[PDB]
Amino acid sequence: KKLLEELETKKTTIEEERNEITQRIGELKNKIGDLKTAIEELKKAKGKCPVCGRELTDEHREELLSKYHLDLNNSKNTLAKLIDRKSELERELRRIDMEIKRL
């Protein structure tokens, strides 16, 4: 019985992880999108920001570019890892059920 209890609790723990990961994947995609369109605009700068109009030097443009591309890649590496993790948790869930149904 306590075995069943532990399985049921482990199952809710997995679903919580899977639901949080699902939410993280969505946010990361939004972030990745924002980074790309930001990098796009930034490349059009030539002394002034094309979005807000304020002064933006080639030096800063460049640095802002390096920073955003580093943020973009890291977010894509995390996205990929999140996807794999979600797929793994789904197999665990199917398996945790397997054990339950039996008991």
Added chain:
Amino acid sequence: MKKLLEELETKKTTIEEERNEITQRIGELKNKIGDLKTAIEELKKAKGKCPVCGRELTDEHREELLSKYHLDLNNSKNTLAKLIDRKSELERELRRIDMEIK
């Protein structure tokens, strides 16, 4: 005669020059129109800071800037519609000058 002919050739050329400048305006204009649409798209994303350079972008400045860009966008589209119609007309006149020339 020979002077009528000259006048016809000289007018033909002034029309091609007009037609060629409008063509160039249209190209620039279109690119300015795409730039305003992309600047507005990014600007709609601001919430305290400019999403592009990270500077402070207050909600008040965002709306004002959004007003200016929308205003320049619609106008640019106004001029563009006009230039295209003018160019279409100049080409009508060019075809008409050639006839007169035969």
